[PDB]
Amino acid sequence: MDPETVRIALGLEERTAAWLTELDELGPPAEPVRLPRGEEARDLLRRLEVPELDAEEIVAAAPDPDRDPALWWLLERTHHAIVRHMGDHRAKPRGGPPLPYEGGAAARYFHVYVFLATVPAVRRFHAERGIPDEVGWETLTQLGELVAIHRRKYGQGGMNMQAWTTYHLRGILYRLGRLQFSLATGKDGTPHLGLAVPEWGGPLLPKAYDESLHRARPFFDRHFPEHGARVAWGSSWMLDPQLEEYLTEDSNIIQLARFWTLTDSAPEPGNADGDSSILEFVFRYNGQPLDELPQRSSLERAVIAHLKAGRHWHMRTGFVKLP
Numbered sequence: 001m002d003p004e005t006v007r008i009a010l011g012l013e014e015r016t017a018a019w020l021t022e023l024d025e026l027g028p029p030a031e032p033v034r035l036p037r038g039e040e041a042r043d044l045l046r047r048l049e050v051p052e053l054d055a056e057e058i059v060a061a062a063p064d065p066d067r068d069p070a071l072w073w074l075l076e077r078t079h080h081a082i083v084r085h086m087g088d089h090r091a092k093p094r095g096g097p098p099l100p101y102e103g104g105a106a107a108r109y110f111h112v113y114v115f116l117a118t119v120p121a122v123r124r125f126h127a128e129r130g131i132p133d134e135v136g137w138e139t140l141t142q143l144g145e146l147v148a149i150h151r152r153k154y155g156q157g158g159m160n161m162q163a164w165t166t167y168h169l170r171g172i173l174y175r176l177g178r179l180q181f182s183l184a185t186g187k188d189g190t191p192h193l194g195l196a197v198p199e200w201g202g203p204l205l206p207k208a209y210d211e212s213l214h215r216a217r218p219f220f221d222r223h224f225p226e227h228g229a230r231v232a233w234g235s236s237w238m239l240d241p242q243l244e245e246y247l248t249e250d251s252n253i254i255q256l257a258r259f260w261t262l263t264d265s266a267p268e269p270g271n272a273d274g275d276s277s278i279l280e281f282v283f284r285y286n287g288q289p290l291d292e293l294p295q296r297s298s299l300e301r302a303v304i305a306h307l308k309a310g311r312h313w314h315m316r317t318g319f320v321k322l323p
């Protein structure tokens, strides 16, 4: 198959053509793609904390090379595009486009199949690096979270955070307790660790935050001694000082953000670019009228009140020195 046939068959937009050309030139992987199927797939999906409903649906719809040749072509090459950058934190997180849901469950769960096909490769990388098994598995369990989020957000099964899962699948992100850390470099090449906060695992209790920070240097200095980061960086809705108007002192976000040194300029008050981030993480927002959104927590109320007052939320960037 040629990439135009694939684009057309899958319903992908014209601006994906360059990506499909790139994948065409890359070609199939040296090790052919194997999807686990049946109970093997159920066992793997359960280990990845994929909810039972979604897992049953993923196994049932697992695509076939003969019956799904366009989708299969894309699966093979997308897998290859990830594994060619195993351990490479300088490569951009290009997981490929989402497939139109007119392709059914196979299209909806396309990037779950990518993930499942790439588990063996990343687990081999974990092993080569001396990563403890419990750490490697705990890292990959964010698949289950992301699957659960899609259903909460859109009402059916899926997983459309494939750009994010390229980090996990390239062996460049590790969950070390409550927080995740990624190998990263600044514009001047200086190593840092990118810090992120998965949804699952409960509130960001100061003791859980502090413990994760204490694990970072030891972990990366042992398994990735070539990196040698001394600071963690973050870009988040959570680092917006405007939250202090609305959240009390007992807020975990307020308490933890006080340790951070913000490095970006105070944003323009009219800049609305950060609104979508906070709406995603607080509401899994999907274009609904704002007065329909829940108001059970102080943050939910705060996000809506601030927007209703004609004001805007901003993602801010900063750092903390690693213990």
Ligand SMILES: CCCCCCCC(=O)SCCNC(=O)CCNC(=O)[C@H](O)C(C)(C)COP(=O)(O)OP(=O)(O)OC[C@H]1O[C@@H](n2cnc3c(N)ncnc32)[C@H](O)[C@@H]1OP(=O)(O)O
Residues within 6 Å of the ligand: 195, 196, 197, 198, 199, 200, 202, 203, 204, 205, 233, 234, 235, 236, 237, 238, 239, 247, 250, 251, 252, 253, 254, 256, 257, 281, 282, 283, 296, 297, 298, 299, 300
């Ligand atoms: C510390 C800086 C790190 C910066 C780099 C991070 C880069 C990123 O990863 S950006 C993405 C961040 N991740 C997320 O947003 C994941 C989804 N969010 C969450 O799960 C939570 O917001 C979480 C766990 C981070 C923090 O929760 P928690 O510890 O409860 O926050 P806290 O500040 O104590 O909450 C204050 C109030 O807001 C509520 N609240 C907090 N988060 C949320 C949320 N996402 N949705 C709805 N309500 C919320 C709390 O329930 C609490 O309610 P009340 O005052 O009514 O009792």
